[PDB]
Design a protein around this ligand. Structure first.
Ligand code: URF
Ligand code: URF
Ligand code: MG
Ligand code: MG
Ligand code: MN3
Ligand code: MN3
Ligand code: MN3
Ligand code: MN3
Lengths: 486, 486
C-alpha cells in the first residue's frame, strides 16, 4: 500500500508519472526587447533562467491545497431537486435523441496528439493506424471496451501536470503560480467517450437554445447568442476563483445523474459516471494521491459536466434568492456557461448581495469579470459584459464578441512551436502562421481604422520574413468578412 | 397606333395576350360538404358555376382603377436624400461585393415552369435544353443579351393576369375581387437577371443583418430575426391596402438608383433599370395600355426593388415624425420588410398618429395587421405581432413564427393539381403530398397537444387513401424537430 500524506492528501500508491515538463511551446516572434510588464510563458522550474523559484513539484503542492479545504454547503434539498428536474426536463425537450457510440467512433473522437496517460504515457498517435489503436494502447482500449460493454467498474488514474500558457508577469517574477491539469488514462477516455459522446453531441448541436455554449463559434454563433441575452433587462459577469477545486462531488453527481438518464445506454453510462465521480486517483509523480473532492478534469465530457454543475448552482442561488420556480426563472432569463464562465441575463429583480452570499455559501468564490471587490454587480446593458475573453459589443448591425487589443498584441509577440527551454528564443519564419494571421487581422478590424492599420504593419513585416507573402486587405473588406458570415 | 382609353388608361397598341385563365389549380381533398364560410379559389368568370358575375375582363378593369389615381406626395427632399444615403451606406457596409452574372447564369436562374410572356407566351421549359434556350425563346434571350451587353434600351412588355389563389368567401359571393399580376417578357427577365442577379444574391445572404428578409427561412432564420426585433421596446404591424398600385415611380427610381450603384456593372444596369421604370406597357388582351405609375411587378428583382422602396418610405415617415437622423434611427430600431409587409421595432418614442398621417400623405394606405381602424397602434411586446402570415410567439426556448390554425385547416381542405373548371372536384390520392403533410404536422405541433392530435387524424386518413402510408410521429418528437434545427 502506502498512506501516507502528500500535499495534505492520502497517498494511495506509488506514482508512475513522467517528470513535469520543464519546457514551453512559446517562441518570441521578434528578437527585440519585450514591451514592459508583458505576459510570458508560465514558470518552468529550476532550469528556468528567468528567475530562481521553487521546484515545479512545490508549485504543484501549492495547486493541490484547495482540494483538502472544507467543502461549502449543499443547496437546500428542495431547491436542488426542483432545479435538477427543471434542467433535466428542458434537456428532454431540446436534445435530439441519439444512437449509441461504437468502439470505433469513441477511439476516432480522441485527440491523437496528446498523451495516453496511465500506464503507457505515450502520445496517442504512436499506436494509431488511422482507424484503430494497436500495440500497447490497443490493449488498453480493448480491455476498457470490454469492461464498458459488461457494465464493469474500472478505477480511473489521472496524471497531474502544469499548464504551459502565457501568464501576467506577476505569476513569474512575483508570487509564482502555475495551473494544475488532470490527464485522464486512455481506458477512462474511451469508456467516457462511448458512454457520453452521444449526449455531448446532442448538447453541442443545441449550443444556442441551451445555456451550455460548448461547441459554439464566437463569430457565427455569438451574434445570435448575444441577441438572446439582450432580450432581458439586467446582465452580470461573475468570474470565479478556483472553480474546479471548490466544486462539490455531490453536485457533480447530480450533473452526472442528468447525463446518465439522457444517455442512450443509461445502465452502461451509470458504471462509467460512478467511476468518474468516485474518489479520484491522481498521479503526482512520486505518488498516486486520493482526491476525494473537487472536479476531476481529465476526460472528453468534462467541460460539459462542469458547465452542467454550473447551471445547477446558478439556478439554485437564483431560486434561493428570488423564490421563483426554476422553470419560470428560465423563462425570465438567458444564461451562458462554459466551465467556470458565466453570463446571466434576467428580467427578475435579483438581489445581487444575497446572490453573492448564496453562492459563497455553496463554497464558490465569485468575483467580477474585470472589476474586483464584491458583491457581484448587475448592469442594465449587455454592452461591455465579457465572455470567453471577449467583450460583448453591439452596434447598428448587431452584437459580437471583440477580443481586446492587449490580447491581440499578445498573440503577435509569441508563436507556438516545438518545446524548448528559453521562452525568449526566436525560431525562423512561421509559414504555418498565415491562417492565424488572417484571424488576427480580423480580430483587429473590429477596433476601427487606426488600430487595424497598426497591426496591419506588424502583420506585414512578419509576412515578409516568411515563406508566404500576403495580400493585406483593406479595413472595410475584412471587417465585412468578420462581421457578416459564415 | 391607337389611343384610346381603356380602364382609365392610354392605349398604346393592340394586345397579343392569351385569354385570361378560366380555371383553378386547387382541388378539394374530400368530397364532403365544406366547413361554413371557408375559403375557396378566387372567381373563375362566366364559366364559374358557383356564382354569376362579371367577366374576368371586367374584374381586371376593376383592378386597374388605382393606377390612374392621383399619386401621393413625395417625402421632403432633404429627408429623402438623407435616408437614401443612409440605406445605401448601410448596404455598402454589409453587402459582399459580387462578380457579374453571365448569360448562362441569368438563363439558369429563371423559373422554367412559368410563361415566357411577350411575344411567344410559351411555357419557359418548352425551349430549354437543360442549359440553354433554343428555338423561339433562344432568339428572344440572345437578342436581349446583345442589347444588354451593348447598353441599349429595349422597351418591356408586361402581360396582365389574375391570381389563382384561395380567398375569403366574400370575394367570391359578395363583392367580387381578384388580384392583378404582371408578367414580364423573357427578354426583360434575362436583362434584369444579368444586371441585378448579383445584387439580389448579395442582399439575400444578408437577410438577417439587413431589414429585407427576402430569402429567409421562417424556421431556421425566424428565431434569430425575431430575437433581434425583441431587443427593442416598441413594436408595430402596419398592413397596407393596394401597396403596388399606390407606389410612386419617383421613389421606385431611388430604390433603383441604390440597386444600380451597388451592382457590379453599373453602366449596364442603368440601362436595364431605366427601362424597368419607364412608363410601362401592359397587355390586357385587347390592348397594351400605358401605366405611368405604380409598381411594375413582373421581374426577378421586383420583390427586392419593392422592399427597398418600402425601407425608404418607413424611414422617411419615421425621420419626418421623430426628427432623428436616418442612420441613428437604424441604430435605435430593427425592421423587417417583404414587399408590402412590415414589422418596425424601435426604442424611439414614435408618435403613431403622426406616423400614420405622414404615410397617408405619401399616398400609402396603412391598416393594422389584424385589428382594423387606424391610426396604427404600437405594442410593448413583440408577442403577437404578425409577419408573413405567421404569429410571432416567444417562450422559454425562443421566438418563432406560428401559422394560425385557420391556415392549417385550410391547407388540409385543398390540394394543388392540374388546372380544371370546378374547384369542388376531388382528384385521387396525392402521393406527391407526403412532403407537404410533414410540414403541416410540424406547423400544428406548435399549437400544443390537443390541436396536433386532431390534425394527426386528418393527416392519417389522407395518408391511408394514398400510395405512401406514414409513420405519424409523437407530438414531442415533431415539436423538437420543428423548433430546433436545421
Ligand atoms: O472564466 C474563465 N475564463 C478563462 C479561463 F481560462 C477560466 O478558467 N475561466
Ligand atoms: O402583407 C401582405 N401579406 C401577404 C400578402 F400576400 C401581401 O400582399 N401583403
Ligand atoms: Mg475565471
Ligand atoms: Mg398586406
Ligand atoms: Mn453548436
Ligand atoms: Mn447551436
Ligand atoms: Mn438568407
Ligand atoms: Mn441571412
Amino acid at each position: 500500500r502506502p498512506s501516507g500524506t502528500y500535499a495534505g492528501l492520502p497517498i494511495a500508491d506509488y506514482g508512475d508519472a513522467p517528470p513535469l515538463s520543464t519546457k514551453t511551446m512559446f517562441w518570441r516572434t521578434s528578437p527585440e526587447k519585450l514591451p514592459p510588464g508583458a505576459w510570458e510563458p508560465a514558470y518552468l522550474g529550476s532550469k528556468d533562467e528567468r528567475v530562481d523559484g521553487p521546484s515545479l513539484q512545490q508549485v504543484m503542492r501549492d495547486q493541490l491545497k484547495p482540494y483538502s479545504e472544507p467543502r461549502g454547503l449543499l443547496p437546500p434539498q428542495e431547491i436542488l431537486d426542483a432545479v435538477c428536474d427543471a434542467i433535466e426536463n428542458r434537456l428532454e425537450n431540446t436534445l435530439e435523441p441519439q444512437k449509441p457510440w461504437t468502439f470505433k467512433k469513441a477511439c476516432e473522437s480522441l485527440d491523437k496528439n496528446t498523451s495516453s496517460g496511465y500506464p503507457y504515457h505515450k502520445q496517442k498517435s504512436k499506436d494509431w493506424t488511422g482507424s484503430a489503436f494497436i500495440g500497447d494502447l490497443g490493449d488498453q482500449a480493448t480491455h476498457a471496451n470490454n469492461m464498458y460493454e459488461m457494465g464493469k467498474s474500472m478505477r480511473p488514474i489521472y496524471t497531474a501536470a502544469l499548464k504551459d500558457e502565457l501568464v501576467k508577469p506577476d505569476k513569474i517574477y512575483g508570487k509564482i503560480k502555475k495551473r494544475l491539469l488532470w490527464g485522464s488514462d486512455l481506458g477512462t477516455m474511451i469508456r467516457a467517450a462511448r458512454a457520453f459522446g452521444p449526449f455531448c453531441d446532442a448538447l453541442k448541436e443545441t449550443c444556442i437554445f441551451n445555456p451550455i455554449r460548448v461547441g459554439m463559434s464566437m463569430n457565427e454563433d455569438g451574434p445570435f447568442i448575444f441577441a438572446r441575452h439582450a432580450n432581458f433587462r439586467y446582465h452580470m459577469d461573475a468570474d470565479y476563483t478556483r472553480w474546479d477545486s471548490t466544486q462539490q462531488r455531490a453536485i457533480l453527481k447530480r450533473a452526472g445523474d442528468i447525463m446518465v438518464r439522457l444517455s442512450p445506454e443509461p445502465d452502461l453510462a451509470r458504471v462509467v459516471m460512478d467511476d468518474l465521480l468516485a474518489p479520484s486517483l491522481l498521479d503526482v509523480g512520486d505518488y498516486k494521491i486520493v482526491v476525494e473532492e473537487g472536479l476531476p478534469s481529465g476526460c472528453p465530457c468534462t467541460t460539459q459536466l462542469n458547465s452542467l454543475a454550473h447551471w445547477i448552482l446558478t439556478l439554485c442561488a437564483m431560486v434561493e434568492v428570488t423564490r421563483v420556480d426554476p422553470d419560470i426563472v428560465m423563462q425570465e432569463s438567458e444564461f451562458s456557461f462554459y466551465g467556470d464562465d458565466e453570463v446571466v441575463s434576467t428580467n427578475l429583480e435579483l438581489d445581487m448581495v444575497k446572490y453573492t452570499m448564496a453562492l459563497r455559501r455553496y463554497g464558490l468564490l465569485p468575483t467580477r469579470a474585470d472589476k474586483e471587490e464584491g458583491p457581484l454587480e448587475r448592469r442594465q446593458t449587455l454592452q461591455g459584459i465579457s465572455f470567453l475573453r471577449r467583450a460583448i459589443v453591439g452596434d447598428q448591425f448587431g452584437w459580437y464578441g471583440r477580443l481586446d487589443r492587449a490580447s491581440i498584441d499578445r498573440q503577435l509577440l509569441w508563436t507556438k512551436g516545438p518545446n524548448h527551454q528559453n521562452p525568449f528564443e526566436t525560431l525562423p519564419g512561421h509559414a504555418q502562421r498565415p491562417s492565424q494571421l488572417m484571424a488576427l487581422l480580423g480580430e483587429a478590424a473590429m477596433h476601427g481604422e487606426k488600430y487595424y492599420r497598426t497591426v496591419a504593419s506588424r502583420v506585414s513585416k512578419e509576412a515578409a520574413q516568411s515563406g508566404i507573402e500576403m495580400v493585406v486587405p483593406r479595413h472595410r473588406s475584412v471587417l465585412r468578412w468578420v462581421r457578416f458570415g459564415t
